[PDB]
Design a binder for this molecule. Structure first.
Ligand code: J7O
Ligand code: J7O
Lengths: 306, 306
């Protein structure tokens, strides 16, 4: 029993974190095989970021302009390329610690673990969701660029996020490991802000199913609802529309608890309309939307990774 | 910016997790140098746990009654001893992955990271606090015994918790790595329950300081309070008394924000008396008490570990 925001074991990622220095700029990089991946704004000064031309800035750099430190050992750079907003530094040494890995671009609403790092050195690990507005509510200070987000499936680390910047609202923005930003953001100091966000409906439902699996049932009712009538209440409370594909995804949890998906939607409808009345669910006074259906199954059923 | 329940990087602990089988019972063990540590109830059947005599049960076992699996390699046991509620199995191989480590018995209110494990295989990592009633609100299923809680300081892993059991309220109970239970609990199936718990006052205050460091100030006021008058409100809301040593501990955070500790106590007094009025602090509609003053400084200042 219990339900926690649970991150994946970070060991396989810790062994890939290195430090990348270009000029006076230092940030984190990800060392897989003989390539280090880091944000391309490593080549920039603060004044560059106001309006940078990265092809021009990068053309003026050499392999020896990039210092790569992996613990004590320095790594010699033998090539460099730019792919979208990430820099790929080829090095003379394959990382002996390279895990089985993939690069994945996740959909909004999916979760991942973040290994926060400074100077190539891991600081901590925590779970995040990709918000509908393609930001994340992480925990990031100056120097954290190039920290990565990931999932682990069996042996295989699927990297899905590399940190680039913090937006004025204090939420965070970054790219997939191929350098493509999530959302409309760009690696330039301009007026750009998080757009309007919404609550991830299928995730709230999953979390309500986790609560039932863990013995909380106070919020259940005998009512039901149609998908159409639910989505109308969803719109009014700034929740994302629930699709039939979302319903199908909640299949296994609905079957494990004996609560039909549309029956859980009627429960959530009442919670949105009435509030919690000073009660809590799984230790939260809010409706939690950062657990996927997969996250609930993984933690309420004890999946492991090696 | 941002504030998250942040666990330590778990890599140094992952390399110590092994599987221990005695009879039909299988659980997790911690392999440091040439010793594996696991809960001594590994030697028990379910009927044994009703009223076990561990000296008698253990006297009837041999070294070859214990199977120890570390990934693929099986480890040969060459000795065994019981220390309080932990079993120490001596093995023929020193763990090549042994980190710098210590065993620490924490005070209630301190936090640690838990690496949840099944069959010697890490499942996930999360932060816990030792509650005042010496339970933890973890996330643990059948098979998780011998999972450990820990802190990392620089290079050194300080193990502080090994998981033994789940109490009827769904909270968790276990020992230090020397086998001494936190709280009054014993490794027997009896009527024992978590006692009355309280809210960790110094921790709530620390978290209010984290919110200020992160730009939330809506809950501040111009009032002040005396330590004595605060503690009287604390008693009424089931908060722990704030000691002068607690005040001194909050020194660095009070100095960084320019808010006197007793001024933050007056803020908290008002929050307890008025509620939050549908507002949130650091994304919580509750007063959060599972961050220590150290945890706030570590995350709002970017400490790392190698
Ligand atoms: C706060 N502001 C933005 O993050 C920001 C927002 C926009 Br809109 C556009 C840019 N932009 O394009 O320059 C931004 N960066 C400003 C510096 C950034 C960010 N950074 C970090 O270490 C960092 C990471 N996470 C959270 C942080 C919170 C902080 O309070 C301070 C720093 C960070 C280093 C990087 C950099 C790039 C080139 C030369 C020097 C430094 C990029
Ligand atoms: C639920 N009940 C108690 O945990 C419990 C409570 C008291 Br009061 C006294 C004992 N007691 O002394 O036996 C308890 N255990 C019952 C079995 C325990 C617990 N366990 C786990 O794997 C486990 C860990 N965490 C959370 C769990 C939640 C679950 O729903 C089911 C299992 C776990 C295995 C171990 C064991 C020991 C000897 C022989 C076989 C198994 C110890």
């Amino acid at each position: 029993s219990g339900f926690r925001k649970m991150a994946f074991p970070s060991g396989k990622v810790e062994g890939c974190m290195v430090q990348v220095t270009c000029g006076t700029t230092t940030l984190n990089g990800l060392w897989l095989d003989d390539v280090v991946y880091c944000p391309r704004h490593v080549i920039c000064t603060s004044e560059d970021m106001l309006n940078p031309n990265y092809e021009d800035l990068l053309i003026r750099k050499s392999n020896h302009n990039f210092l790569v430190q992996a613990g004590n050992v320095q790594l010699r750079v033998i090539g460099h390329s730019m792919q979208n907003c990430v820099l790929k530094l080829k090095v003379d040494t394959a990382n002996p610690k390279t895990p089985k890995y993939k690069f994945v671009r996740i959909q909004p609403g999916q979760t991942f673990s973040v290994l926060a790092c400074y100077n190539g050195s891991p600081s901590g690990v925590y779970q995040c969701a990709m918000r509908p507005n393609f930001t994340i509510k992480g925990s990031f200070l100056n120097g954290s660029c190039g920290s990565v987000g990931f999932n682990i499936d069996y042996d295989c680390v699927s990297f899905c996020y590399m940190h680039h910047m913090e937006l004025p609202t204090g939420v965070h923005a970054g790219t997939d490991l191929e350098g493509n930003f999530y959302g409309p953001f760009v690696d330039r100091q301009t007026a750009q802000a998080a757009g309007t966000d919404t609550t991830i409906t299928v995730n709230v439902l999953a979390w309500l199913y986790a609560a039932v699996i863990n013995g909380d049932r106070w919020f259940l009712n005998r009512f039901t609802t149609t998908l159409n009538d639910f989505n109308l209440v969803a719109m009014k409370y700034n929740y994302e529309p629930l699709t039939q594909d979302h319903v199908d995804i909640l299949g296994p949890l609905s079957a494990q608890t004996g609560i039909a998906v549309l029956d859980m939607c009627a429960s959530l409808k009442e919670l949105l309309q009435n509030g919690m009345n000073g009660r809590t669910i799984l230790g939260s006074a809010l409706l939690e939307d950062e657990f996927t259906p997969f996250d609930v199954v993984r933690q309420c059923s004890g999946v492991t990774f090696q």
